[PDB]
Design an enzyme around this catalytic site. Structure first.
Site, PDB file in Angstrom:
ATOM      1  N   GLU A  83       0.842  -1.187   0.000  1.00 37.19           N
ATOM      2  CA  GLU A  83       0.000   0.000   0.000  1.00 37.19           C
ATOM      3  C   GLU A  83       0.881   1.242   0.000  1.00 37.19           C
ATOM      4  O   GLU A  83       1.820   1.339   0.796  1.00 37.19           O
ATOM      5  CB  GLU A  83      -0.925  -0.014   1.222  1.00 37.19           C
ATOM      6  CG  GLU A  83      -2.013   1.040   1.235  1.00 37.19           C
ATOM      7  CD  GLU A  83      -2.729   1.134   2.581  1.00 37.19           C
ATOM      8  OE1 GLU A  83      -2.197   0.607   3.597  1.00 37.19           O
ATOM      9  OE2 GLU A  83      -3.829   1.752   2.614  1.00 37.19           O
ATOM     10  N   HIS A  92       0.908   5.201   0.712  1.00 39.87           N
ATOM     11  CA  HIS A  92       0.084   6.161   1.441  1.00 39.87           C
ATOM     12  C   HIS A  92       0.971   7.268   2.007  1.00 39.87           C
ATOM     13  O   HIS A  92       2.197   7.156   2.023  1.00 39.87           O
ATOM     14  CB  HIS A  92      -0.717   5.465   2.549  1.00 39.87           C
ATOM     15  CG  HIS A  92       0.131   4.886   3.641  1.00 39.87           C
ATOM     16  ND1 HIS A  92       0.601   5.636   4.701  1.00 39.87           N
ATOM     17  CD2 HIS A  92       0.587   3.628   3.844  1.00 39.87           C
ATOM     18  CE1 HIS A  92       1.308   4.865   5.507  1.00 39.87           C
ATOM     19  NE2 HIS A  92       1.315   3.642   5.012  1.00 39.87           N
ATOM     20  N   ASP A 121      -3.457   4.543  -1.970  1.00 37.17           N
ATOM     21  CA  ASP A 121      -4.408   5.017  -0.978  1.00 37.17           C
ATOM     22  C   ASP A 121      -4.592   6.513  -1.185  1.00 37.17           C
ATOM     23  O   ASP A 121      -3.611   7.260  -1.227  1.00 37.17           O
ATOM     24  CB  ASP A 121      -3.893   4.701   0.427  1.00 37.17           C
ATOM     25  CG  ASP A 121      -4.775   5.261   1.525  1.00 37.17           C
ATOM     26  OD1 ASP A 121      -4.716   6.481   1.775  1.00 37.17           O
ATOM     27  OD2 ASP A 121      -5.501   4.471   2.166  1.00 37.17           O
ATOM     28  N   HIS A 175      -7.366   1.988  -2.189  1.00 39.11           N
ATOM     29  CA  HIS A 175      -8.077   2.433  -1.001  1.00 39.11           C
ATOM     30  C   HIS A 175      -8.639   3.828  -1.254  1.00 39.11           C
ATOM     31  O   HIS A 175      -7.883   4.793  -1.407  1.00 39.11           O
ATOM     32  CB  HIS A 175      -7.136   2.448   0.190  1.00 39.11           C
ATOM     33  CG  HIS A 175      -7.082   1.155   0.919  1.00 39.11           C
ATOM     34  ND1 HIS A 175      -6.137   0.891   1.888  1.00 39.11           N
ATOM     35  CD2 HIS A 175      -7.856   0.048   0.825  1.00 39.11           C
ATOM     36  CE1 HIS A 175      -6.335  -0.329   2.360  1.00 39.11           C
ATOM     37  NE2 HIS A 175      -7.375  -0.858   1.736  1.00 39.11           N
ATOM     38  N   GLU A 192     -12.056   3.436   2.687  1.00 45.41           N
ATOM     39  CA  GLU A 192     -11.340   3.250   3.942  1.00 45.41           C
ATOM     40  C   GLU A 192     -11.465   4.527   4.758  1.00 45.41           C
ATOM     41  O   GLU A 192     -11.009   5.591   4.325  1.00 45.41           O
ATOM     42  CB  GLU A 192      -9.859   2.887   3.725  1.00 45.41           C
ATOM     43  CG  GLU A 192      -9.133   2.658   5.055  1.00 45.41           C
ATOM     44  CD  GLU A 192      -7.811   1.905   4.945  1.00 45.41           C
ATOM     45  OE1 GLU A 192      -7.841   0.648   5.029  1.00 45.41           O
ATOM     46  OE2 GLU A 192      -6.740   2.570   4.841  1.00 45.41           O
TER      47      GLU A 192
HETATM   48 MN   LIG Z   1      -4.985   2.810   3.566  1.00 42.10          MN
END
Ligand SMILES: [Mn+2]
Ligand SMILES: [Mn+2]
Lengths: 151, 290, 290, 151
Positions: free
Chosen positions: B155, B157, B187, B224, B260
């Site tokens: 991920e 982010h 994300d 996300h 999310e």
């Molecule tokens: Mn996330």
């Protein structure tokens, strides 16, 4: 489930098969310390954003099966459990639009073991004279959201 | 088995949102019906949270899981796992121990019908980079992952930028190996432009522009949809959602965007995260058409 | 199968106390472990609340039930049922319909190991008297009840006095039939002396003295230990508990006293009824020795 | 279960077999959004009515089985689930007396995927610099009642 009587889960529009919106549903939990048989239930009146909707427009789904108010008034063997919220399906062509909606629903149930002052004037749309919380309020409200495109 | 065949980006929810509620006021089925009310089909679960008797569910539980998917029209999309080499305080886990644990999660994810894995690894520095043997761990599991049709994705982010070392080291790896079963989960916190007056912001974070994602979409298998605040007009007030979603529409994305929500009010009493998510999905449905 | 063989009165809890909590924050097992923390062995359940899939539990659920009893040292004591002849709005239930429903509850109670039934009937006047055919209903079920070792008991509670019509009509019935399987459950609200300034009290209610129960103990098979308020010194501030419990000790009682708490704060947020019950059982243990 | 970390259910004294009180137990729920393996746990320090009790006096029971802090530090395959509160058994001859008791317990767990500032100085008895509620507080309190005769 939730402490509120009207549940946040299960509030959605209802489609047809042929894709046309026929109404909407929402769940109510029995606010009683015990279950009741279907024939003990007394469905009352719904208000959605102030629009009034009579009980003849609302069916009850309990134990996977759909009942009319009339079907229910005669069935004293089918049992509604406190932990198994009923699904009320409301007839309304087009359903509810995108966004917020204010719900006011009333219903109550019979308790023939209670003093006969209490049992009389037992109105699904009006609260009992004195309030005992083990029986819940007959009328409950909830502000919930519907997911839909803008018209 | 229910299938959702909209073309282009599809909306979903990550059960991490029901984080204050799961096991307390919502059950796994409550979460499924909550996604259903929204019309959401895609789901993301966390291995160490939502699989009963993890890591070894029963045949009974697995079949209950598939029944839930059919009953509420849920597509298992992304399956979140950890390869925790630092699980032991006294030592790192060997590459083989890490691969045995990763492979195990790949099997479980496949059995439950998932198709993307959001793999989180221990971090060794402040750029959030993985353990040094991460190339070796992933290369150990890649043949199994390719066999079973799974794509493993770390991920990306905040504070990581779409063109910092972390992203380019992953993209470099994909190119050198040629694998189509490793990739990126972006994300949306990497596009966040608005913050509160007095809200601390990592001096290393710079917003990316929605176009910054375009050369990476070959490698992005699931996103996300982070979000911070929904207005009562069902707009997101901190991220250029319209521009991000349109960029991905126009540039060939077919994956999911999974809600999310990580706000701390999740854990305040009276908070109704299901309502917050419905706000977020009113926006998402309006941008995608479904 | 666990058995509790203290001589004389024994303490327990009625799951009606966990009424705001059951199905929301406590499970059936939570309630059992809560009774265990207290050292309480006797239990009272409500048929329409605590038996899953009532009125027809599975063989799996029944065996889980017995496992809970063994695991937490619980004795099924009293089983609360309703003979609701007024269940239908349009008509009364015939005597045969009422007996078929009563008999059914007697079987379930026996299968779950219970030995007293707290039977509530519809009421026809303001003295809380039962439907007129109540003698016929009970006489229909008495042979089954005698076979299966169950004792059916209506509950005597405020405003009913220990020497009004309601009690003496039941005692008269026991004497005329000679049955040892019908009897009385006395709820301690009939000894309540203290109330709040401004708290309404039924003009028909008069407290009974603890000795008022002595000629009835031949017919008392289980008692509801009602209580209103526990001090932080673990005394009950509205009922002469010491004198009631000692009367029953001295006069040959071998049944249970089951905590029943009905306060409305049960349903206020933050209320911890398990703590309230622990207060009540500190008093109960000190009075009984165990 | 309960929202509080220390559970009201399962707080009782512990007997011997030979009838002598050896200690007491209480349950703690994992306040994490995911489960952890036993080797991730870092048990901290207990305070009962101000009396300090070290971790070497407290065992963890998870999945029906009792573990020591040492046993736990080496076991990275056994998994503690968020919905399965651990039972902490505390060594203390005679146990706790009738009535109220104030509990303060601390513990935390490792999360190697977090930024390394966060993971360092991760003390089971002291709160993290900034507080993220999806991880819970390391230290939690609860006032609970013990049922026993008066001495
Ligand atoms: Mn996330
Ligand atoms: Mn009572």
């Amino acid at each position: 489930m939730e402490k509120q009587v009207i549940q946040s889960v299960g509030f959605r529009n209802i489609k047809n098969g042929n894709g046309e919106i026929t109404g909407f549903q929402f769940k109510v939990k029995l606010p009683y310390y015990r279950g009741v048989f279907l024939s003990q239930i007394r469905p009352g009146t719904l208000f959605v954003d102030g629009q009034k909707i009579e009980k003849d427009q609302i069916t009850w789904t309990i134990n996977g099966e759909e009942y009319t108010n009339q079907e229910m008034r005669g069935d004293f063997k089918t049992h509604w459990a406190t932990t198994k919220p009923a699904v009320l399906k409301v007839k309304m062509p087009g359903g509810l639009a995108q966004g917020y909606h204010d719900l006011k629903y009333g219903f109550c149930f019979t308790s023939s073991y209670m003093p006969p002052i209490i049992q009389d004037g037992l109105d699904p749309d009006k609260e009992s004279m004195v309030y005992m919380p083990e029986f819940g309020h007959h009328v409950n409200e909830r502000r919930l959201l519907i997911v839909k495109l803008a018209a | 088995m229910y299938r959702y065949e909209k073309k282009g980006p599809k909306r979903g929810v990550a059960l991490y949102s029901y984080s204050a509620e799961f096991g307390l006021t919502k059950t796994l089925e409550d979460c499924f019906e909550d996604l259903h009310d929204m019309g959401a089909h895609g789901i993301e679960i966390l291995a160490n949270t939502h699989i009963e008797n993890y890591p070894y569910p029963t045949d009974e539980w697995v079949e209950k899981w598939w029944r839930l998917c059919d009953k509420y029209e849920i597509v298992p999309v992304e399956y979140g796992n950890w390869i925790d080499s630092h699980v032991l305080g006294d030592r790192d886990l060997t590459t083989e121990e890490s691969v045995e644990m990763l492979k195990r999660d790949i099997r479980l994810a496949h059995r439950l019908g998932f198709t993307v894995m959001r793999t989180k690894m221990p971090v060794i520095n402040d750029l959030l980079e993985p353990v040094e043997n991460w190339k070796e761990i992933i290369k150990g599991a890649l043949p199994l992952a390719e066999e079973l049709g799974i794509k493993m994705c770390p991920e990306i982010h905040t504070p990581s930028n779409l063109k910092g070392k972390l992203v380019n080291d992953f993209v470099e790896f994909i190119k050198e190996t040629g694998t189509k079963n490793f990739g990126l989960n972006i994300d949306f916190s990497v596009f966040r432009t608005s913050f509160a007056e007095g809200e601390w912001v990592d001096p290393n974070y710079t917003p990316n522009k929605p176009e910054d994602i375009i050369p990476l979409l070959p490698y992005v298998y699931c996103c996300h949809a982070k979000f911070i605040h929904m207005s009562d007009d069902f707009k997101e007030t901190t991220i250029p959602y319209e521009e991000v979603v349109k960029t991905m529409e126009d540039n060939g994305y077919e994956g999911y965007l999974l809600s999310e929500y990580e706000g701390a009010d999740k854990y305040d009493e009276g908070y109704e995260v299901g309502q917050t998510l419905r706000k977020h999905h009113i926006l998402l449905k309006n941008l995608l058409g479904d």
